[PDB]
Structure formats: C-alpha cells, structure tokens
C-alpha cells in the first residue's frame, strides 16, 4: 500500500541496543504496541484457537 | 534513445573532473 527522518538521541543510541535477533515486520504486527512507535490505527489480532 | 537526458548518478567511474581540460597559449 501507499503510505498513510529521526535524529540521534539518548534513547535510540545503538551502542546501548543489544542486537541479537533481527526484528521483523510480523513481530511488529503480532504485538503492535511493544515494538512500534506511534501506533495510530492498528487493530488487535486474534490470538489463538 | 528517445531524447530523454539521463542523470549522472552512478554513471561516472573512470571520469575525473580535471581530465580533458586544456589551457590556452599566450596570444602573440
């Protein structure tokens, strides 16, 4: 789909972040509030049957 | 090749800037 620029900080310092496993898109889609900044119009997916 | 001038991004590998630039002789 078509879409519906961040400086460095103390917060997003990559010397503090432990890179162990690469975070993918479906991680940000399954748990949309843990891995996402500005989650404006997301929907909570069905967990399990 | 329907006209269409192209960009120079990436299309310079062996071309420098000072190359093929010549200077004039003193007139008379």
């Amino acid at each position: 789909f078509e879409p519906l620029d961040e400086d460095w900080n103390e917060f997003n310092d990559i010397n503090k972040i432990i890179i162990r496993q690469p975070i993918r898109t479906e991680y940000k889609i399954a748990f949309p509030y843990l891995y996402n900044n500005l989650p404006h119009h997301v929907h909570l997916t069905w967990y399990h049957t | 090749p329907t006209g269409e001038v192209l960009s120079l991004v990436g299309k310079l590998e062996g071309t420098r800037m000072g190359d093929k630039a010549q200077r004039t002789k003193p007139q008379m």
Partner: protein, 1049 residues
C-alpha cells in the same frame, strides 16, 4: 474576482435600497465618484476625510474599505503562497502581486518609522557610552590616524574619479536603447569625463556644503522566495557618492582600518575562504584529540536586522573618530531623505539606506563594533597582533597566545559570523553549570528546538547526546549575553551550533553556500583511499601527513534559487525566440557550475534537478515547434553550436548519440559515396576543481616571486618569454599582469564587497557576484567544449545533413555567413526541417501538400508558412516541365549516333508532376531498325550484359523527390519506383524497356535505373550533369531557398 464584484454590488444595493426615490435619483451619481477615491486614498496610504459627509454613511464607507482591504491582503498573501511553492501562473499575476506586496511593505515601513519617532530612541545612554568608549580604546590601541579631507589636489583624484565613472557606466553597457532619464545620466557622466577638475570642485562643494538631497526611488527585485529592495538615486549626487566610496576604501586600505578576519577580501574567492577555514581548523595544536574529554564547538549565526537597526546619530558619533567631521555629516545626511513609491512618500530616520554607494563602508565599520562586543578587546588584540607587525588571516603570534583562550577561530562574512571554540573538560562543565543556573531544565526539553542539518545521513550529522546539547546551548547563551539587544540581536532559530566530542565523530558547518562535514582519519576505518570528487584531503602544515577529510555539498537555498531561476526562464512568452531561452539556460548553468565546481558531483539531488530542468527546457522547445508530442527528437537540433545554425545548449546529463545518425553522403562524378564517422561531452569535466586550482596557484605565484627576485638583480624586466609556461594558471590569473590598466586597477581597493552590494542598486540579477574579470582574470575555458561538441556530432559534414544545406548549392561552408546573436523561429524551423519532418519523429500521421511532393509528418504551421512561400505559383510543375524540355532538347541533337528516328514528347498531364501513386512515360524514342537492350541496372553501373530482346520503343520518365534525413538515398528509391511502376496494373508504359530518372530536391541528388541501349548511358550521365549544373528552374528554387534561409556568401 467576481465574488468581490458581487460583494460590491450587494454593498451598493444595501446603500441605495434604504433611501427613497428622490434620494435614489441623487445618490446613484453622488457616492460612486468618491467611492473609488476612498479606496485609492487607502491604497496610497492617504488618510481619508471629506467635509459635508454624514457619520453612518461614513462608517459604511469605512466598513467597505476595511472589508475590501482584508480581501485584498489575503488575496495578495495567497498569490505569494501560490508562486512561492512553484505553482504555474500568468506573468501579469506576479507583476501585480509584486506591486501589492510593495505597497504593503511600504505601509509597514511608514508605520515602523513613525513608531520609532513616537517611542523615542530604543537604545539607552549607558550602552552607547559603552560602545563609544570601546571604540575609543580600540582605535587608541591601534594608533589609527583619521582619514583627512582631500584639500585641493591629492594627485590621485583623477584616477579615483575615472574608477567611479567606470563603475557608474558599467551598468548601462548592456543595451543600446535607453530612457530619457538614463540619457541625462550618461550626459552628466560624459560632461564629468570632459572636465574633471570642475567635477572635482562640484564634489568637494557638495561635501563641504550640501546637506539636503532629492528623493530616492524604491523598487523590488522579483525573487520567488524573498523580496529585495533596489534604490534609485539622483545622478549628480551619485557621482559624489561614488567618489566618496572610492576614496574611503582606498584610504581605509592604506591606514589598515579593517582587521584581517573581516571578509570578503580582495585576494580570495569565497571557496578559497572555505578552504583556508578548513585548513585553519586542521592546523591547530592537537585539535582532534579527545582522550581527556575536550570539545570543539562550531557556531554559525546571522545578525538579525543589522541593516534596519542602525541609529543614525550613534552612527555619526562612531563615524567621527575615523574621518573628517564634514564627511561624517555628509554620510549621515544622505540617510535622512524621503523614499517614494509612485504615490507614497515617507522620510527615513531609523536604519541606513543600504543601496547607497558608500554604504558598503558603513556596514563593514559598524560590524567591526560588533567584533569588540563579541570577541573581546584582549582576544582581538591577540588575533590581530601589534600595529607595527599585523598578523595574517587565521594566524597568531605564537602557540601560547593561540591556545591561551577557547575563542580561537573567528570569521565574519558581511553579516554572518562563524566562530570556532576549543574547550577542555572543566571549562565545559563550568559553562554548562553557568547556563543551568539561570535556565534550569528538569524535563530535558533542550533537545526539541535544536536546529540540525537534515541533508546528511543519520550517523553523519550531529548525534544529540545530552552533554553536547547542553554545551551548545551554553555556548549560544554565552555569545548572546555579550550583545545588547537594542543594538543587534542574534536568534537560536536562525543559528547553528555543531559539537565535536567523544560521542560526536565529525564536525559540521554551512559557509558561503557550502555544506562542509569534517571527519578525522583516526575516528574512522583504514587507509583504503578511494578517490572521490567533493572530498578535500586535509593535511598538517608541519609533518605534512593526512589528518582529516572534508566533504562538500550544496545547500538547499542555492538549489531552490536555481529552480526559481529555471521557473523564471520558463515564464517566456510565445513571441520569445528559442535562442534567448537557451542563452538564459546557459548563463544560469555556468553561474551554477563555475561557482559550485567540485560540490555538484558529490550531491545527487542537484544532479537530478539539473537533468529535470534540462528536459523541461527541451520540452519547452518541443511544444513550441509542434503541438503534438514527438516520440523521438534529435539532440543535434539543440546541441549544435550557433555558428552552424544550432542553439549551442550546454550539457549536464547522460545523452548518447544514436547510431545511423552519424552517417553522411556526397555525390560526385564517380557516383554517390557514403561515409560514417558516442556521448555528448559534459560541462563538469572541462572545469578545474578548487583544490588543484589552489595548489597550482600557490606554485605558479611562488615561481613568479622567484623569477621576479632573479630579474631584479640582473637588471631585467620580465616579459612574455619567461611567463608563457604558466599562462592561464593560478588565482589571481598570471594573465592579469599583462594588462593596460595596471596603474588604474591598482588603486581599486575593496571591489568584491562593492560587487556584492551592487544587488541593491541594479534592477537586473547579477550572476558572478563573487568575482570581477579585471581583478581575478577569467576562471574557465569553454573553447574545448565547442570543439569537442562539433567533433562529437560527427563533424561539420555530419551536422550539415540535418540542415537543408545541400539544397542551397554552395560548394563549401567556409565562405558562408549568416545575416545579422539571435536566430528567428521561422528560420530555425526551415533550417532544421529535414530532421524534424521525419517518419520516426511524429509517428503514424502523415499528409501531402497539394502542389508539391512534400510529405508532412504531423502538421507544422511554422514550416507550412515557409513551404508555401518557397514553392508558390506551381514551381514543382515548372521544374518538372523544364527538366523534360531540357532533356528533350538533349535528345533532339546527336540523332544519327544512337540510330534514333523519332523523339516524341508525351502530353504530360498537369497533375503528373506531383501524383505518386502511378506515373507515365515522358520522352519516347523510336528505334530506326532495332535496339539491343540491357538488364535493368543503375546509372553508375558499368557491368552491362545485353540480351537478344530487341525492342523499338524506348521510354524515359522523370521523377522528383523531397526527402528527409533517413530517406534520401536516391538510388534505392529510383530502383524501388522502377520495380513498382513496371510491375503494377495501374501505371501505363508503352514499352517494356526503359529507364526512370529520379531527382531529389532537398539534397539535390540524381540517379537512374532501368534498361540501357548502346550509347545511351554516357549521354544521359553527361546530360543530367549539365541539367543539374545549368537548369534555370532549379536555379530559381535554389535562390528562393537562399532567400528564405537568409544565408549568403
């Protein structure tokens, strides 16, 4: 605009419907007169008041004026917002919008001057005493001797008056047609040339006596981003102001008034300023070592409203220290004069008139007073050094006074300051504590609001760690405290502070349009050394090893101003010639490239923008030729130089010349010979980079110094023999020594800042503001570009096949000339008709003109209006009948040698000369007894084997052609028409054995294909040679083409 008219109609209905009929019959022709006069008096800022008017109808008039004023103001702001963003609009909209915003700015200026007259002086007495005693202590510390008044004969007044009159006549040399007020100015300047001593007496009398001045006119230069004023001064005062300007700069350069940090100087272009600033950042004592927590700070800022906030009385008091007091009174008296715009008059009392001649001194001295406030007296004395031995730019006395203070590099361009600090750990902690004492930050809010440079990548720009942000806020606070806000004001939103620390591996600044990023060698990876353009390699002065790299980019404002210049070029009307548009593009492209030489290659967005603007410029000509969009279009229409009839367009892009467009052909006595001769050469390769230019400059001037030192001791004058090794090299150019005006140009000091401040005096824009050719020399060479452009298009013979040249029957090109800078559109279209009117340019649609055999691909009215004029009055049929009758008179004589018994001219139908579906025979020969015929072969074919098919009747047909660049091969055309017309059920030929002769008019070619009886082929070759050399109808066609193209010899 109809909604405002309906609103006015509603207001007039609400006025007139209330009053009864005896007043309806009166106020319909009473209110409507002064109703426009009230709006006119509002627009001219005149207070509207008339006696004999009732008060509720007066309030109705005021409500009407207020509502229309709100509508008009919002309309003007919306029209400026439309054209600022780049939306296309008519030119008259911008022309009216400039006047609307001119009147609004005049109403704002007349309001703020009356506010200054009402509220009193905004400066206190104590700050004035502080800056006055500061200037007194500085000028007494340097032993400055004041500039004296030139008494009677300074013996340099003549040369200074010559320089002033040359700078006055420099503007009017563009066009040869002027107005009467300009002719009066040129007459006054010529009378000043004729009698110099009377002019000097008038200047000195106006200096010692005159204090009242005529009104100064104001106009605005229409930039799409930012309006800028241009001032118009009376010429009699302007001569005196120019002489005062010259004398003040020449005296201030000799007395050493200005410290070497004040920029621009006369010895450096601004990229050399950037290069020397980078070298000064590199060559400090241990500048990149951060093992103990040191920091580097780079402040860049601009003095806000420096031109408008100069009080004139304070200016006079500060100006009486350096010159004679009558001179200071004359410099203050010119600033207090009435400014006029066409209806609006207002006096000036606060802020200087920036468009004066001598005003270039006033900004540079007053800003010197800022350096005593920012830099401090002790540090300025350590930077400038003693008066008997001054320091160089970015140089100190010793290393101890270099490292004794954190403020250790300083530079001031006209109103932009650049300061470079070196802090230790404890000094940075103390400065952050002094900042946080008065301004606490409990929520860490000083990150939001930090100006940063988005053009670089994320790891390349400044990393916003909290200590470095607090140090930057503390630096800007410490600088802002030193300036009284009534005198000058700096702002955080217009400033930038870069910090180099342990957490920040690189340093950033913006100066002279360059975005510079400095990155040390020891903060990055290994040696690898891949050479890139726009990458300056920084080395130390002592050990001469590599220490850092400097990365160059073009800032956003330069690219936006260039794109606004392209949008100004695309505002050309329909009557504008193509050559004017191409010349404006060439001027803008040289003014971009020759200033941003090494940095255009590094930035990619500018390289996309250049190609996008170049395609829009070419599309502007493509739509101008024909309404329908062409599928292809040759670049040789554009990139051909103007000598050969082209446009001479400069190239920044990747354009490849397609194959089978570099072929050409030529017909001579042995037959038709074909010949075959790639990328268009670019501009950036033909310009020297700045780094090699500065190294070579230093090298050639060191060699000139050694040769001059050797030539003095040998009693030898240097000539052209010893300096012919280093002509064109270095900056200034060595070529500037060998010039006629040495003693004249040697008295011109401070020319670069005057050339920069010409923008407030001349209405036209000024590319190359940063240079002057008589002082720097010429800084680029483009003869190699035109040479490689002619060579790259396949040579002159390869170019001239597109150009309808061989229809003119000139034997060479070298003796030819064009009738006289600019070529019209009709001549350009008729010249390049063989390469525009092709099958592969306008695909599919083709028609035929009525009385000719010309195929028009698409429809072109600008070429139709010329092809009607060339081929008027049945010239096609007359040429056909003339060729037929001349060939009939050829076949009439020499009768017994071919055994001809009867030659017969066929009855030619008057539509046969231009119909192309079928044909008919034209000349019929009867054999006496019998004729042996050969196989169908070409005109130049000599391998003929004749058959036993003896025939009696022979037929000769004549065909005409008007070809194009790809289809003009007359041999295959004649062969195809012979094999078509002898093998079809529509054409009529009385004999199976014959020949077809084809003549192409657009290139003047001729061939023949068909059967041959003995003795016929050399006779027909010599006959067609004689016809193509000596046909009078072809001569009429050729002289009409030479009359239409305006090409003579």
């Amino acid at each position: 605009s109809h909604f405002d008219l309906e609103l006015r109609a509603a207001v007039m209905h609400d006025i007139l419907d209330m009053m009864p009929e005896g007043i309806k019959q009166n106020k319909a022709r009473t209110i409507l007169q002064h109703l426009s006069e009230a709006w006119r008096c509002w627009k001219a800022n005149i207070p509207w008041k008339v006696p004999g008017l009732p008060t509720p109808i007066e309030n109705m008039i005021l409500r009407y004026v207020k509502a229309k004023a709100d509508w008009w103001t919002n309309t003007a702001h919306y029209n400026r917002e439309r054209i600022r963003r780049g939306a296309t609009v008519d030119k008259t909209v911008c022309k009216k919008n400039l006047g609307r915003l001119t009147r609004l700015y005049l109403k704002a200026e007349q309001e703020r001057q009356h506010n200054y007259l009402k509220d009193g002086p905004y400066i206190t007495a104590e700050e004035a005493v502080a800056v006055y005693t500061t200037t007194v202590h500085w000028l007494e510390s340097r032993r400055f001797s004041p500039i004296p008044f030139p008494p009677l004969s300074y013996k340099h007044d003549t040369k200074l008056l010559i320089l002033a009159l040359e700078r006055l006549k420099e503007a009017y040399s563009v066009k040869s047609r002027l107005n009467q007020s300009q002719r009066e100015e040129l007459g006054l300047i010529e009378q000043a040339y004729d009698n110099p001593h009377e002019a000097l007496s008038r200047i000195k009398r106006h200096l010692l006596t005159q204090r009242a001045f005529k009104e100064v006119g104001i106009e605005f230069m229409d930039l799409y981003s930012h309006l800028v004023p241009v001032y118009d001064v009376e010429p009699l005062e302007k001569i005196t102001d120019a002489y005062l300007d010259q004398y003040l700069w020449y005296e201030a350069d000799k007395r050493r008034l200005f410290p070497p940090w004040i920029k621009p100087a006369d010895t450096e272009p601004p990229p050399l300023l950037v290069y020397k600033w980078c070298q000064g950042i590199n060559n400090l004592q241990d500048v990149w070592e951060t093992s103990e927590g040191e920091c580097n700070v780079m402040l860049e800022s601009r003095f806000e409203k420096m031109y408008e906030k100069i009080d004139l009385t304070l200016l006079n008091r500060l100006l009486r220290l350096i010159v004679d007091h009558n001179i200071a009174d004359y410099m203050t008296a010119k600033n207090n004069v009435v400014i006029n715009y066409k209806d609006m008059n207002h006096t000036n009392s606060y802020g200087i008139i920036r468009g004066l001649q001598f005003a270039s001194f006033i900004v540079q001295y007053y800003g010197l007073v800022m350096d005593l406030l920012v830099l401090g007296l002790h540090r300025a004395s350590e930077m400038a050094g003693p008066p008997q031995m001054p320091n160089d730019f970015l140089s100190f006395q010793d290393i101890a006074t270099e490292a004794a203070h954190p403020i250790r590099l300083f530079c001031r361009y006209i109103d932009r300051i650049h300061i470079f600090f070196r802090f230790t750990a404890d000094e940075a902690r103390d400065l952050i504590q002094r900042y946080l004492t008065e301004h606490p930050d409990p929520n860490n809010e000083n990150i939001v609001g930090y100006n940063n440079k988005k053009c670089w990548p994320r790891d390349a720009r400044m990393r916003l760690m909290k200590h470095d942000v607090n140090l930057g806020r503390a630096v800007f606070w410490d600088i802002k405290n030193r300036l009284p806000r009534s005198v000058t004001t700096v702002q955080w939103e217009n400033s930038f502070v870069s910090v180099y620390s342990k957490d920040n591996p690189n340093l950033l600044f913006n100066m002279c349009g360059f975005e510079c990023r400095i990155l040390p060698k020891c903060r990055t990876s290994y040696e690898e050394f891949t050479h890139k353009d726009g990458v300056w390699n920084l080395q130390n002065e002592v050990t001469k090893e590599r220490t850092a790299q400097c990365f160059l980019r073009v800032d956003d404002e330069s690219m936006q101003r260039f794109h606004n210049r392209v949008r100004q070029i695309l505002m050309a009307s329909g009557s504008t010639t193509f050559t004017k548009i191409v010349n404006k593009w060439n001027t803008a492209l040289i003014g971009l490239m020759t200033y941003f030489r090494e940095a255009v290659v590094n930035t990619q967005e500018l390289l996309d923008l250049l190609v996008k603007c170049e395609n829009k410029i070419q599309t502007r000509i493509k739509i101008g030729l024909n309404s329908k969009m062409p599928s292809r279009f040759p670049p040789v229409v554009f990139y051909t130089p103007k000598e050969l009839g082209g446009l001479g367009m400069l190239s920044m892009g990747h354009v490849l010349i397609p194959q089978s467009d570099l072929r050409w052909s030529k017909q001579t006595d042995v037959g038709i010979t074909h010949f075959r001769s790639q990328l268009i050469p670019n501009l950036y390769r033909y310009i020297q980079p700045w780094e090699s230019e500065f190294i070579d400059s230093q090298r050639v001037w060191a060699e000139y110094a050694l040769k001059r030192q050797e030539a003095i001791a040998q009693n030898r004058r240097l000539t052209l023999e010893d300096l012919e090794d280093s002509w064109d090299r270095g900056i200034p150019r060595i070529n500037t020594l060998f010039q006629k005006d040495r003693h004249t140009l040697a008295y011109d000091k401070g020319w670069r800042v005057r050339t920069d401040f010409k923008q407030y005096q001349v209405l036209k824009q000024n590319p190359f503001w940063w240079t002057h050719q008589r002082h720097d020399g010429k800084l680029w060479n483009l003869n190699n570009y035109r040479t490689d452009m002619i060579q790259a298009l396949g040579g002159v013979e390869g170019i001239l096949e597109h150009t309808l040249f061989k229809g003119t029957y000139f034997p060479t090109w070298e003796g030819l000339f064009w009738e006289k800078n600019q070529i019209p559109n009709r001549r350009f279209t008729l010249w390049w008709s063989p390469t525009i009117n092709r099958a592969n340019v306008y695909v599919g649609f083709q028609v035929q003109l009525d009385l000719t055999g010309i195929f028009m691909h698409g429809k072109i009215p600008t070429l139709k209006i010329s092809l009607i004029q060339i081929f008027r009055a049945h010239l096609w049929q007359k040429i056909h009948e003339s060729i037929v009758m001349d060939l009939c008179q050829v076949f009439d004589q020499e009768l017994d040698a071919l055994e001809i018994e009867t030659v017969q001219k066929e009855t030619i139908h008057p539509r046969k000369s231009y119909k192309m579906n079928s044909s008919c025979a034209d000349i019929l020969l009867f054999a006496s007894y019998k004729w042996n015929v050969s196989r169908p072969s070409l005109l130049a074919d000599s391998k003929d084997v004749m058959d036993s098919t003896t025939t009696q009747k022979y037929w000769i047909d004549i065909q005409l052609r008007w070809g194009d660049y790809d289809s003009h091969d007359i041999e295959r055309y004649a062969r195809a028409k012979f094999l078509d017309y002898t093998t079809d059920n529509m054409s009529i030929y009385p004999s199976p054995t014959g020949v077809l002769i084809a003549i192409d008019l657009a290139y003047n070619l001729h061939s023949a294909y068909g059967n041959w009886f003995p003795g016929s082929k050399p006779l027909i070759q010599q006959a067609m040679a004689k016809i193509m050399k000596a046909n009078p109808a072809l001569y009429v066609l050729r002289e009409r083409i030479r009359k239409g193209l305006q090409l003579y010899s």
